[PDB]
């Protein structure tokens, strides 16, 4: 339990290649947070990027 | 120019290009073969990016 992402270090392994040759210039990461039970509004959750 | 046009590969392309005269078939019999860009938008278009 911390107040944010801890110091400390960790490394990464791979999944896919996908051979796609495009052009991407932008991003974007949707998830549905909408209890349409009480009504359809943002819900809390946040998420890090770099 | 077929290639900067179109199609390019990279300066280390590793691999084989295959190719033979194909004279019997739609390419000379009644067909369209085209997409043959002679211009370009900005600069070559950056092997593999299609």
């Not at chain 1, 911390?2 to 051979?19: H, I, N, T």
């Not at chain 1, 210039?25 to 946040?46: D, E, I, K, M, V």
């Not at chain 2, 194909?22 to 593999?48: A, E, I, M």
């Amino acid at each position: 339990l911390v107040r944010d992402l801890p110091q400390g270090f960790s490394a990464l392994e791979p999944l896919v290649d996908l051979p796609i040759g495009i052009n991407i210039t932008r991003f974007q990461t949707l998830l549905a947070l909408h209890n349409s039970s009480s009504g359809w509004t943002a819900g809390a959750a946040a998420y890090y990027v770099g | 120019k077929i290639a900067d046009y179109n199609y390019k590969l990279p300066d280390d392309f590793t691999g084989c290009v295959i190719a033979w005269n194909s004279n019997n078939l739609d390419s000379k019999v009644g067909g369209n073969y085209n997409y043959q860009y002679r211009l370009f938008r900005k600069s070559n278009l950056k092997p593999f990016e299609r």
